[PDB]
Design a protein around this ligand. Structure first.
Ligand SMILES: CCCCCCCCCCCCCCCCCC(=O)OC[C@H](COP(=O)(O)O)OC(=O)CCCCCCCCCCCCCCCCC
Ligand SMILES: CCCCCCCCCCCCCCCCCC(=O)OC[C@H](COP(=O)(O)O)OC(=O)CCCCCCCCCCCCCCCCC
Ligand SMILES: *[C@@H]1O[C@H](CO)[C@@H](O[C@@H]2O[C@H](CO)[C@@H](O)[C@H](O)[C@H]2NC(C)=O)[C@H](O)[C@H]1NC(C)=O
Ligand SMILES: *[C@@H]1O[C@H](CO)[C@@H](O[C@@H]2O[C@H](CO)[C@@H](O)[C@H](O)[C@H]2NC(C)=O)[C@H](O)[C@H]1NC(C)=O
Lengths: 149, 100, 458, 124
């Protein structure tokens, strides 16, 4: 029920409230590019990107049972350790996993925030799998959005 | 209960206006979930809708089975994470944020 | 000028750009419609009782300046010096910055229809209006007054359109937003005192009604009668413009608005919705062109006593303009808009203005015990300057006790910075003072070709 | 000689020099060129700004079956008054749009909703 899940820090209501607040405060999630990787029998990996902002969101969602993921074989240029922004198990928020071995349980999702300047929609090997509506760049100097991409 | 190429006709033409989006229930029609079947729903909407249009996503509704009874208790959190990280507008049926 | 053309200059002076910016910030502090209309009426009583006290001081002393000959006659040189210092660096450039910022809110709003303009566009357009007016008034002294009468005609027309079209909608039955006008409100001393800062900005000009409306057919009777008729009649036009805003907008829609009268002209005057961003933008640079006519009048009379630099209030040889004062006001007003933000420049202005309105009206009561035998032709009853000096300490102390922000520190430190310059350049004239003041005056004289004004006190 | 408060007759002997004519003409023409740049920067940003998002693109929608949300008059059915008492819960979910399904005056409340009056609310 609603009343008991407001006092539970691991409840489904608290993850929904953290996901919808993150969606409202981040330009990457409500406006940015959607670049998906290749298909897999277990997991779904995609990125949210915007040109001008120098960080990306990496969403990793396991829809099979428990598996191990090597994220170095999907996205190039990743560090040895990545910090978790949001997880479907709320105890693992702000922790650090290693990129070569990520243990995903059955029904686990992870959101990584990665500071980089190499976006996938600018690489021609990934341009066929990237999508936008209302295309715009971001100028960090002026704090505006502009269309002259 | 429609093919994907007939649903995207409600988006309209680049010079004729129509609905802002047609409602997308293709994730509500999944009775079992997998990595290939979720990839097939997401990529078929993004490839078939016209460029520059706005997508939307639903995982339930009053005519669908509820999510924790359709897929299991372990998929409540990961389908809410899928709904809020996909591009477009997420649509939430009442009680899905709790897990009814 | 008779009586009827005496009250027409009062209405034309007091109607300014304030009624197009202030309704958002009065409703933002008193969150209901009912208390929002009481503050708009109580501000017109403070403007009427305030202008009556200035009417007695204007006939008793009869000297040019502003409040500067009034404070010298009551307290001496030290509050007269601090008024000349605070009107140079605080009061006059902020008034030029609020008006030019209000011009750029009304040009940029119809281009960003359902969202805000970014802060870089409203500020880079406001700086282009400061530098355009500061060069036009520094070249062509008579050009500012040919266009001045068509900028006042554009102001009264767009006020009369909003009042009349709001009374038509009020007759048809669009009165739902007035139904529960007193539910959800604030009796905090910081919510009411900042609602008075924004309402009294829309009445700006009541303290300079003395100099221009005393060349009448029968003074000492028609001057206090034009104030009792003129300023309560503009108070009726300000209440009727807020009544017109609340027929087409809810109190939540008015807070979620960039310019309040563009949103009005988008719901009433539909095929001609662009006349409200056009006429308000004409009337706002006319209110900024009008404040550059007054540049140099107080600076000349304060420099005659040694309380202000004499390189200011010099006159250009070609294009006989007060060019060092207009350029000095354009520089400080451009600095003020980089932190910017109307609702943060109005608090900065009203704190220094009402500190010296309160010292001046208190000097009317001090000069009833100290400066008798002085021929007061106008003499207001004593309860009127007592109430005006009790509200003047309520409008100073209550923001700095309940809701203290950073502008009330930067305004106090800029006024007390002048109290250091009194004790080094006026009270204790040293040796190294005039050998800084004279080479600067000499080298700025050859740069701008400006001379002393071949003149007398007047 | 330039002393402090030179009249017109003494000033013209020195303001025509080279070291006071060119810093006066440069600073004037760098001011009206700063006006033309600040307007050309204002028009360039307004012309290059994107159309910002509508309300139906900004936030999530929340679909409510109104008979099963909140009963307020203790008759067993959810009503529109019960939805109004729960609007603080909906804003705490960071929801933009409320979607309410069919509440028209109906004979049939399922099977795509046979409706009796399109301009009336059903009395439950
Ligand atoms: C960062 C915070 C501080 C910022 C300070 C920024 C200072 C920038 C100065 C920019 C001045 C721009 C002037 C040009 C505006 C022209 C307006 C106009 O229409 O003119 C008509 C007028 C008519 O001339 P005509 O064209 O011959 O008819 O033209 C001029 O007068 C141009 C003369 C330029 C005046 C420059 C004044 C600068 C004074 C600086 C003094 C500094 C002394 C400090 C010493 C301290 C010692 C302790
Ligand atoms: C064109 C614009 C520039 C021209 C006008 C400004 C002049 C530029 C130089 C500024 C002053 C230079 C240092 C002071 C030199 C004179 C000192 C002296 O002995 O006075 C004798 C002076 C009398 O000199 P006399 O005119 O020769 O009789 O005594 C006084 O006037 C006392 C009052 C002092 C007023 C000081 C004015 C300060 C203006 C600059 C304010 C700076 C803050 C700006 C705002 C902060 C950021 C928002
Ligand atoms: C659910 O109901 C239970 C019991 O009815 C509540 O638990 C406690 O109930 C006693 C009364 O016997 C109260 O004195 C306590 O204060 C209650 N515990 C707490 C922590 O408040 C419980 O509060 C109810 N609500 C939930 C679990 O959300
Ligand atoms: C990713 O998708 C591809 C394409 O659908 C899959 O490759 C083949 O898919 C067909 C039917 O879609 C099957 O009949 C074949 O057996 C698949 N080939 C192989 C080698 O399995 C592929 O299986 C998908 N999954 C991955 C790569 O994990």
């Amino acid at each position: 029920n609603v009343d008991v899940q407001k006092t539970q820090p691991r409840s489904a209501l608290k993850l929904y409230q953290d996901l919808s607040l993150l969606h409202a405060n981040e330009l990457l999630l409500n406006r940015g590019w959607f670049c998906h990787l290749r298909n897999d029998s277990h997991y779904v990996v995609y990125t949210r990107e915007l040109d001008g902002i120098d960080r990306i969101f990496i969403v990793v969602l396991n829809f099979g049972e428990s598996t191990l993921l090597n994220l170095h074989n999907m996205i190039s240029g990743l560090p040895a350790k990545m910090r978790i922004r949001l997880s479907t198990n709320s105890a693992d928020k702000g922790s650090k996993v290693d990129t070569s071995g990520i243990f995903l349980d059955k029904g686990e999702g992870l959101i990584f925030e990665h500071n980089t300047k190499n976006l996938l929609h600018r690489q021609t090997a990934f341009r066929d799998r990237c999508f936008v509506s209302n295309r715009a760049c971001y100028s960090s100097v002026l704090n505006i959005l502009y269309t002259s991409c | 209960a429609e093919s994907i190429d007939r649903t995207v006709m409600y988006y309209g033409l680049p010079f004729i206006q129509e609905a802002d989006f047609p409602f997308n229930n293709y994730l509500s029609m999944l009775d079992t979930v997998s990595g290939n079947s979720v990839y097939e729903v997401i990529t078929s909407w993004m490839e078939n809708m016209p460029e520059g249009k706005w997508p939307n996503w639903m995982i339930g509704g009053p005519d669908s089975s509820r999510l924790t009874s359709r897929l299991g208790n372990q998929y409540v959190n990961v389908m809410n994470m899928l709904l809020f990280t996909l591009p477009g507008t997420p649509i939430t049926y009442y009680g899905e944020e709790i897990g009814m | 000028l008779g009586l009827i053309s005496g009250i027409s200059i009062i209405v034309g002076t007091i109607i300014g750009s304030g009624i197009f910016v202030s309704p958002k910030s009065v409703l933002s502090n008193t969150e209901a419609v009912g208390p929002c209309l009481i503050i708009w009426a109580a501000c017109g009583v403070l403007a009427t009782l305030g202008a009556l006290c200035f009417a007695e001081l204007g006939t008793m002393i009869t000297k040019s300046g502003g409040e500067y000959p009034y404070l010298m006659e009551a307290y001496g040189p030290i509050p007269a010096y601090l008024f000349s210092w605070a009107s140079l660096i605080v009061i006059k450039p902020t008034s030029f910055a609020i008006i030019c910022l209000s011009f750029s809110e009304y040009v940029c709003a119809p281009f960003y229809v359902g969202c805000k303009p970014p802060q870089i566009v409203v500020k880079c357009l406001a700086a282009a209006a400061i530098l355009f007016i500061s060069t036009v008034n520094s070249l062509s002294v008579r050009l500012g007054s040919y266009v001045q009468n068509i900028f006042t005609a554009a102001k009264l027309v767009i006020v009369a359109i909003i009042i009349i079209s709001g009374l038509v909608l009020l007759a048809q039955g669009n009165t739902k937003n007035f139904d529960n006008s007193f539910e959800g409100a604030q009796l905090s001393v910081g919510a009411i005192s900042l609602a008075f800062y924004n309402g009294l900005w829309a009445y700006d000009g009541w303290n300079q009604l003395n100099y221009i409306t005393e060349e009448l057919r029968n003074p000492y009777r028609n001057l206090p009668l034009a104030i009792i008729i003129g300023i309560p009649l503009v108070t009726a036009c300000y209440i009727l413009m807020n009544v017109s805003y609340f027929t087409v907008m809810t109190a939540t829609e008015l807070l979620q608005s960039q310019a309040v009268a563009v949103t009005f002209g988008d719901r009433v005057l539909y095929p001609a919705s662009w006349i409200v961003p056009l006429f308000v933008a004409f009337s706002t640079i006319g209110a900024a062109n009008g404040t550059c006519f007054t540049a140099g009048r107080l600076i000349y009379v304060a420099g005659r006593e040694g309380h202000m630099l004499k390189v200011l209030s010099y006159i250009s040889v070609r294009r006989l303009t007060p060019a060092p004062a207009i350029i000095f006001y354009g520089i400080i007003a451009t600095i003020y808009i980089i932190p910017g933000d109307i609702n943060s420049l109005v608090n900065y202005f009203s704190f220094a203005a009402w500190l010296f309105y309160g010292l001046t009206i208190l000097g009317l009561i001090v000069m009833r015990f100290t400066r008798k035998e002085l021929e007061r032709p106008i003499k207001v009853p004593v309860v009127i300057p007592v109430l005006m000096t009790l509200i003047s300490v309520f409008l100073v102390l209550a923001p700095i006790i309940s809701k203290p922000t950073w502008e009330y520190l930067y305004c106090v430190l800029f006024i007390l910075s002048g109290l250091l310059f009194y004790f080094l350049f006026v009270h204790y004239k040293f040796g190294w003072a005039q050998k800084i003041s004279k080479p600067i005056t000499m080298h700025l004289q050859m740069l701008m070709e400006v001379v002393p004004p071949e003149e007398d006190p007047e | 000689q330039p002393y402090a408060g030179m009249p017109k007759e003494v000033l013209f002997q020195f303001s025509g020099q080279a070291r006071y004519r060119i810093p006066r003409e440069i600073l004037f023409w760098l001011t009206v060129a700063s006006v033309l740049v600040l307007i050309a920067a204002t028009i360039a940003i307004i012309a290059l700004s994107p159309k910002c998002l509508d309300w139906w693109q900004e936030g999530p929608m929340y679909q409510i079956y109104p008979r099963s949300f909140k009963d307020s008059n203790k008759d067993g059915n959810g009503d529109l008054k019960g939805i109004q008492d729960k609007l603080d819960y909906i804003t705490a979910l960071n929801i933009k749009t409320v979607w309410i399904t069919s509440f028209y005056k109906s004979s049939l409340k399922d099977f795509r909703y046979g409706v009796e009056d399109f301009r009336e609310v059903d009395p439950i």
